Amino acid sequence: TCPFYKKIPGTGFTVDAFQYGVVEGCTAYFLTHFHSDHYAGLSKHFTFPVYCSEITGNLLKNKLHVQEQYIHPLPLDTECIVNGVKVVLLDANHCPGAVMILFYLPNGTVILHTGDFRADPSMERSLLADQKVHMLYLDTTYCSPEYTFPSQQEVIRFAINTAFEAVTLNPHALVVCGTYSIGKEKVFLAIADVLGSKVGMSQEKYKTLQCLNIPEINSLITTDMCSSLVHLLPMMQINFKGLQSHLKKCGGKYNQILAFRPTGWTHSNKFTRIADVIPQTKGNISIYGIPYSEHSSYLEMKRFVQWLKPQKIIPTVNVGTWKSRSTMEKYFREWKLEAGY
Numbered sequence: 649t650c651p652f653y654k655k656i657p658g659t660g661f662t663v664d665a666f667q668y669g670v671v672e673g674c675t676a677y678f679l680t681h682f683h684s685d686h687y688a689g690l691s692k693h694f695t696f697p698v699y700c701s702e703i704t705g706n707l708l709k710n711k712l713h714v715q716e717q718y719i720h721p722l723p724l725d726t727e728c729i730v731n732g733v734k735v736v737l738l739d740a741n742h743c744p745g746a747v748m749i750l751f752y753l754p755n756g757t758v759i760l761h762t763g764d765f766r767a768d769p770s771m772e773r774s775l776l777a778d779q780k781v782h783m784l785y786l787d788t789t790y791c792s793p794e795y796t797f798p799s800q801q802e803v804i805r806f807a808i809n810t811a812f813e814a815v816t817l818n819p820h821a822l823v824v825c826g827t828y829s830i831g832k833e834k835v836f837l838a839i840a841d842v843l844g845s846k847v848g849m850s851q852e853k854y855k856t857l858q859c860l861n862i863p864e865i866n867s868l869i870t871t872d873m874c875s876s877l878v879h880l881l882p883m884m885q886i887n888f889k890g891l892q893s894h895l896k897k898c899g900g901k902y903n904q905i906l907a908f909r910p911t912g913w914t915h916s917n918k919f920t921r922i923a924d925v926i927p928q929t930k931g932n933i934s935i936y937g938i939p940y941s942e943h944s945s946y947l948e949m950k951r952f953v954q955w956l957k958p959q960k961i962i963p964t965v966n967v968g969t970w971k972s973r974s975t976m977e978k979y980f981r982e983w984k985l986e987a988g989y
């Protein structure tokens with residue numbers, strides 16, 4: 649059944665609750681972003697209203713073929729009324745089109761649902777600062793002090809310099825980037841840009857990026873693989889077997905592949921710096937795992953919550969075990985006691 653943490657009390661609303669059939673009493677289904685755990689259930693045969701950002705709406709329409717009459721895109725940073733309830737959609741600093749949602753309940757309660765986010769000090773100067781939030785439904789993906797990672801800017805600086813060096817030493821080297829969803833577009837765009845290339849990809853993936861309102865996007869991407877030295881492949885293909893195979897397909901235009909696997913966290917984060925990353929190598933093929941996160945680090949989460957000072961926190965990730973629930977609740981109390989709310 650639809651879990652309680654997908655339900656917004658005092659409303660007929662659910663958030664990211666598309667795989668439970670008709671939910672008894674739901675008058676509007678919110679979708680925070682276009683990742684498949686969150687949209688799972690949606691199709692052309694859906695006949696309830698879906699509320700979402702303009703970008704999420706383009707993807708529902710063109711990728712999932714949801715009929716245009718059931719898609720209700722809202723603008724960000726604007727007070728809107730939906731079935732009698734004031735709502736605002738805010739940038740979540742996750743993948744493109746991803747949002748957080750502020751609900752103003754008729755009774756005076758204010759609720760913030762983060763969807764998936766990477767907390768940032770910039771959110772402390774959004775509409776959030778203007779009034780008190782009583783309940784917070786929180787992306788807790790990385791709620792444990794081991795989870796540190798570098799800034800997205802630091803990671804991108806790394807990738808740009810790595811690629812530029814390898815290609816300038818060997819102009820017959822190919823750069824490959826792994827992907828299995830929207831998100832983490834900066835990696836392949838920032839590399840392609842230092843190299844004076846467009847990014848080459850499949851037709852389905854080109855379709856997906858054309859949904860995202862990226863400025864001057866036409867200048868940056870293509871389906872013509874052969875004119876391009878930064879290729880996107882499915883993440884499943886980012887390995888020695890899969891890259892050797894792919895290297896063959898280019899017909900001796902390339903003699904070396906350098907590949908990037910954007911990961912979330914991996915346990916080398918506990919010991920190693922970004923400056924000190926190294927690849928796995930078999931022959932003329934090297935693979936880098938780079939920790940580009942679009943979720944909050946522990947410290948970024950902590951800071952957001954201590955700034956917001958909510959009355960109750962409801963986690964939306966890692967909820968399925970008693971051990972994880974218990975651990976999260978402990979850190980929430982630590983934060984509350986340290987910041988005196």
Ligand code: NI
Nearest residue numbers: 681683742764
């Ligand atoms: Ni997500």
